[PDB]
Specification:
Chains B, E, F: Keywords: Cytoplasm, Lipid A biosynthesis, Lipid biosynthesis, Lipid metabolism, Lyase. The structure is a homohexamer. Chain A is an alpha+beta fold and 148 residues long. Chain A contains 3 helices and 6 strands; from the N terminus they run αββααββββ. The longest helix of chain A is centred in the middle third of the chain and has 21 residues, at 57-77. Chains in contact: A-B, A-C, B-D, C-F, D-E, E-F. The interface between A and B is large, with 38 and 38 residues. Bound molecules: ligand 2BC and chloride ion (6 copies).
Chain lengths: 148, 152, 150, 151, 152, 152
């Protein structure tokens, strides 16, 4: 397992845009299973929405893109914080996303992504976000790693 | 129904609030058909503390969000017109997102212009599509379907 | 016995960034409560506690146990009543026998387990532990008092 | 140079969030004048309290943005775009005078700072000018800063 | 109308909220003449994250803002006493600032004391001037003109 | 070893940072014996947004935290003096907290004075006890046992 501290050593994202808390499964060039805890104590809930906290669907996707990003980094150079500290990640395409169940405080948002296709710095992954066994969202995306 | 709406009009229609209200002004609007709006991008926004340190790049997913909110405003006013009292008890869920492509990164100092056109709508379910533009160039394309629902 | 953030928001007066209970999984009147708060990196406290080493504050673990306990005491007397809830305030008088055994970090489901040690009138004494995946990460005893909002 | 983006502004000014009030610089003439701006969006924390339901960019923050522009002008005039010397310098602002507010600034506005050097003697720089939104003057003010060694 | 008001009272009179309410307590007040209030300066303020890293210094412009808010409080209570119901239908507008001097940097642990007197006043327009002090020493001087207006 | 330390010195000794650095200044410091410090309480602190709306009260658990940080500063410096290079490698952790009692609510405008005394110390293990005061009145009491550990 990779914990927050390791996640920090690979992903360029920081607060309040680092939406992955832990990595539970990793299989180079194949897939990755990870998650982020959802708590009321997040600033995003002050406006989405007042008196009715609902984790933004677009942030679920960002969390999936980030999980895929970690798969890309590690699959490319392994766990190398040195190289990681010079790159960043750009979103290229998002497609076929569907939300089925709203994610709320108290939820364990689990990301399940598999590599669809990749070449060089460009990676295309797809999968689902699950809560307690159920699919709350599915999506496909292509992200690109680049030098800062 | 007017065609130009300022931040105060937006706050009376959309349920979104800080830090998730991503539309500052509406420049033009055709009921049940089209809407053009924009959000200014400044370094003085909290998302930039983490995306990314020393390299402020407005998140691509937040661009989608702003396009969806533009559609949501279009949806609501096309349904009930500018009715703040009916609006204060509704929210908006994302149902789907398709064919989005990011062409140019958005940075502090940009005037991110949203252009959404209604592709199909029935009752509460609206499906809009369009682009996000900075200085007349297209920085993003997207298609999305969102649902308006009575808060309960 | 199962209360979600929405039910919690109606009883407790605490709001962001000081509402430290996300869900209530078990509740037995005048006896005990079991609730939890999710710990994620996406929380403002982690910007300074501490940079490059995220560790949920121990005093905030106690705060969450207090809120859980205050919630237990309140509903025990009046049940789920948003009305009365606005006319009352549960503040804590003492805290004691606190012990931190394990660090809580982003990714943990911080579970609160409080029971009613004793109560007399509006003064309630609760105690228990903070648990993460079965282990006891902390423990404490608290005495709260229920009063009229004012 | 003449045009600097947020990237360059970060290497010259010490100001950071939530006090970096200049997004880009569109004009720069050493020892003469500077034209820069900051976008005003609702998605800014200050709007949570100034004011609820009535978002109005604080007037003092406009004067601040103007002060930040003058400082970048002063610094660049002395050493040009030098991130390294930048880290060793300070620009204390000593006084502010003749500031008038004419039109409120709100979300959706492009706050353009127009400043010119009014006097430069030794380490003391005196600048003045206006803040403009869409060609109209929304505020004017005078400022005096001192260049010193950071510590 | 008394002369000591705490944050609870200031909240019911001034329209400013976090992170822009910069007056914590009013210690002295003379209708239409003068007021003495203060704001505690602590490191635990978001503004210090950027002003400046590893060198916390309270923004000079914010000290003026605090003096303005003190003036606004005096102005309002002078005209309507402690009236929260009417106070809710107003906001203050900065009209002018002049003669400001920043003599001493203000930092965490300082009790920023505001001293203002009415230089002129007629209707909603009030002109105040004075100093900001820390432990008896003048940290700043300023003159400002504000206006109380119907929020609509 | 001085007895007066300001925010810039506190920043070199404690690893705490916004929004968990709860000590603004140290007025008295006696090695292995005691420390007197304080934190200014202002409305301009994020914590008051939710504790509580329309009724700002400084969290009691945070008073404790501020007392512990003081005791922690006392601990480190009693052992190494003002050694920033070393402080950067150590970190103090709460082991226990006992006999905590809150007597008076803390609010904006208050100067929260920490008074901690060394009850016992052997190596990296320290037991401190004391009170939190506001204008000579005791608003809280507590005892803590801390541990000075490696930061790795
Ligand atoms: O008054 C207290 N907490 N909350 C009070 C309160 C909360 C809300 Br909401 C409210 O609307 C009102 Br009226 C309150 O008095 C409190 C907190 C800590 C204390 C510590 C020692 C003694 C008294 C205390 C009272
Ligand atoms: Cl959503
Ligand atoms: Cl992106
Ligand atoms: Cl801790
Ligand atoms: Cl203003
Ligand atoms: Cl300043
Ligand atoms: Cl408390």
């Amino acid at each position: 397992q990779f914990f927050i501290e390791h996640i920090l050593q690979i992903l360029p994202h920081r607060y309040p845009m680092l939406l992955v808390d832990r990595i539970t499964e990793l299989q180079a060039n194949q897939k990755i299973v990870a998650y982020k805890n959802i708590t009321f104590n997040e600033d995003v809930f002050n406006g989405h929405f007042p008196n009715k906290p609902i984790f933004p669907g677009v942030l679920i996707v960002e969390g999936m893109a980030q999980s895929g990003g970690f798969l890309a980094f590690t699959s490319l150079w392994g766990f190398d914080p040195e190289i990681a500290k010079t790159k960043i990640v750009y979103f290229m395409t998002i497609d076929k996303v569907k939300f089925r169940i709203p994610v709320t405080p108290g939820d364990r948002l689990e990301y399940h992504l598999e590599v669809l296709k990749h070449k060089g710095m460009i990676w295309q992954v797809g999968g689902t976000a699950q809560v307690d066994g159920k699919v709350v969202a599915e999506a496909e995306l292509k992200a690109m790693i680049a030098e800062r």
